[PDB]
Amino acid sequence: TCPFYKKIPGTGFTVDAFQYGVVEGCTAYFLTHFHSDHYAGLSKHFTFPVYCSEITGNLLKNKLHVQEQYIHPLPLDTECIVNGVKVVLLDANHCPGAVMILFYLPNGTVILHTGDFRADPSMERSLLADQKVHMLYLDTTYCSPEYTFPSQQEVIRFAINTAFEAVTLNPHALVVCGTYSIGKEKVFLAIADVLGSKVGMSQEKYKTLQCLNIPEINSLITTDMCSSLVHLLPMMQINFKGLQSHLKKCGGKYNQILAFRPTGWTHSNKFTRIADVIPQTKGNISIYGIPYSEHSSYLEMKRFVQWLKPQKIIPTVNVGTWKSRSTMEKYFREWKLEAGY
Ligand code: NI
């Protein structure tokens, strides 16, 4: 049945709650972003109002064929009224089109649902600064102090410099980047830009990228693989077998692959600095695991919450085990006692 942490009290609203059939008494279904664990259940047969960003609405229409009449896109940073309740969508710093939702309940309670987010100090100067939040529905993906990672900027610097060096040494090397969803577009786009190439990809993936309002996208991507030296493939194919196979298909145009796997976290982060990352190599194939995250680190998450000072926190991730739930609640109490709220 629909879990409580997907329901917004004092409203008929749900968030990311499309796989439970008709939720009893739900008058509006919000969708924070276009990732499959969140949209699971939407299709052309869905006939209730869906509220979301413009970008998420482009993907619902074009990829899942949801009918236009049930898609209600809202502008960001704008007070809007939905079934008589004031709401604001804020940028979540996750994947394209991802939002956080502020609900202003008729009784005076203010609720923030972060969706999936990567907390950033820039959030401390949005419309969140203007009033108090009483309840926070928090993306707790990496809510443990072992989860450190570098900035997105530092990781893209590493990737650009690595790719540029490799291809300048060997003009017959191919760069490959893995993907399984929207998000992390900067990895492949920044590499193509330094190399003076477009990124080549499947028709399905080109379609998905054309829904994202990215500036000058027609200039950066293509379905012509032949004219491209940066290729995008499914994440599953980023292994020695899948890469050897792909290299066969390029018909002796290339004699080396440098591949990137943008993971979330991997335990090499406890020890390894970004400067110190090395690939796994077999023959003329090298694979780099790079820690490009679109979720908060532990310290980023802690800073955001100690700034916001919510009265109650409801985790939305890692809620299925007692040991995880109990450990998170202990961090929340620490943060509150350290900060004095
Ligand atoms: Ni997500």
Cβ atoms < 10 Å from Cβ of 174:
22
Q: How far apart are CA 274 and CA 42, in angstroms?
A: 39
The domain that holds 290 is classified in CATH as 3.40.50.12650
Q: Which amino acid appears at position 184 of this protein?
A: K
Q: How far apart are CA 245 and CA 223, in angstroms?
A: 19
Dig out the tokens for 203 from the structure: 């028709």
Q: Based on DSSP, count helices (H) and strands (E) in the chain, helices before strands.
A: 9, 18
User: How far is residue 155 CA from its own chain's centroid?
Assistant: 16
Q: What is the dihedral of CA 86, 87, 88, 91, to 10 degrees?
A: 170
Resolution in Å, one decimal place: 1.6
One domain for residues 153 and 192: yes
CA dihedral over 202, 204, 206, 209, signed as positive or negative = negative
One domain for residues 110 and 153: no
Closest C-alpha among 185, 222, 180 to residue 55: 185
Burial of 190 (0-12, 13-18, 19+ CB in 10 A): middle
One domain for residues 141 and 231: no
The domain that holds 72 is classified in CATH as 3.60.15.10
Q: How far apart are CA 300 and CA 149, in angstroms?
A: 10
Closest C-alpha among 186, 188, 184, 185 to residue 174: 188
Ligand 1 centroid – CA 74 distance (Å): 19
Ligand 1 centroid – CA 138 distance (Å): 13
Ligand 1 centroid – CA 46 distance (Å): 21
The phi, psi pair for 286, rounded to 5°, reads -120, 135
Dig out the tokens for 202 from the structure: 């499947």
One domain for residues 184 and 105: no
**What's 94's DSSP letter?**
S
Buried b (16+ CB within 10 A) or exposed e, 2-32: eeebbbbeebbbbbbbbeeeebeebebbbbb
Ligand 1 centroid – CA 94 distance (Å): 7
Q: How far apart are CA 142 and CA 327, in angstroms?
A: 12
One domain for residues 129 and 225: no
Buried b (16+ CB within 10 A) or exposed e, 43-75: eeebeebbbbbebbbbbbbebeebeeeebebbe
DSSP for 190-240, written as a single string: HHHHHHT-PEE--HHHHHHHHTS--TTGGGTEES-GGG-SEEEEEGGG-SH
One domain for residues 199 and 265: yes
Q: Please count the structural domains in the chain.
A: 2
Cα separation of the two ends of the chain: 34
Could you tell me if 77 and 127 are in contact, meaning their C-beta atoms sit under 8 angstroms apart? yes
Closest C-alpha among 174, 148, 176 to residue 267: 148
Pairing of β 85-91 and β 80-82? antiparallel
Q: How far apart are CA 221 and CA 41, in angstroms?
A: 30
The phi, psi pair for 160, rounded to 5°, reads -55, -55
One domain for residues 111 and 249: no
Q: How far apart are CA 116 and CA 317, in angstroms?
A: 9
Closest C-alpha among 34, 52, 41 to residue 101: 52
Which range of residues forms the domain containing residue 183? 148-295
Ligand 1 centroid – CA 114 distance (Å): 11
- Partners of residue 177 on adjacent β-strands: 232, 260
- Partners of residue 7 on adjacent β-strands: 14
Ligand 1 centroid – CA 137 distance (Å): 15
One domain for residues 218 and 153: yes
Ligand 1 centroid – CA 35 distance (Å): 5
Q: How far apart are CA 297 and CA 253, in angstroms?
A: 41
Ligand 1 centroid – CA 33 distance (Å): 7
One domain for residues 156 and 114: no
Ligand 1 centroid – CA 107 distance (Å): 31
Could you tell me if 158 and 149 are in contact, meaning their C-beta atoms sit under 8 angstroms apart? no
